[PDB]
Amino acid sequence: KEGYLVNKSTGCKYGCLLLGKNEGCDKECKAKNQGGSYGYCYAFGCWCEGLPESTPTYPLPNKSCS
């Protein structure tokens, strides 16, 4: 399961504006905690491809955000 970097506390995904493979997004989306294989900007959200079934994906099952 892939998906945006949804903040595990607020349920707010880390949204981009500049779509495609964002370098900054790559850093967070393909970060250690994330474990993803790819990190880019889908619909102004950090879409982490290669994501574990353990890594939460927007939106959170606790809280929602924009």
The number of domains in the chain is 1
Would you say 24 and 41 are in contact if contact means Cβ atoms under 8 Å apart? no
Domain encompassing residue 57: 1-66
Would you say 65 and 15 are in contact if contact means Cβ atoms under 8 Å apart? no
Tokens 């606790």 correspond to 62
Q: What is the bridge-based pairing of β-strands 38-42 and 45-49?
A: antiparallel
Coil, helix or strand for 13? strand
Nearest to residue 41, comparing CAs of 8, 18, 11? 18
Exp. method: NMR
Q: Residue 37 — left, alpha, or beta (φ > 0 → left; ψ -120 to 50 → alpha)?
A: alpha
Would you say 23 and 5 are in contact if contact means Cβ atoms under 8 Å apart? no
CA dist 42 and 21 (Å) reads: 9
The CATH number given to whatever domain includes residue 53 is: 3.30.30.10
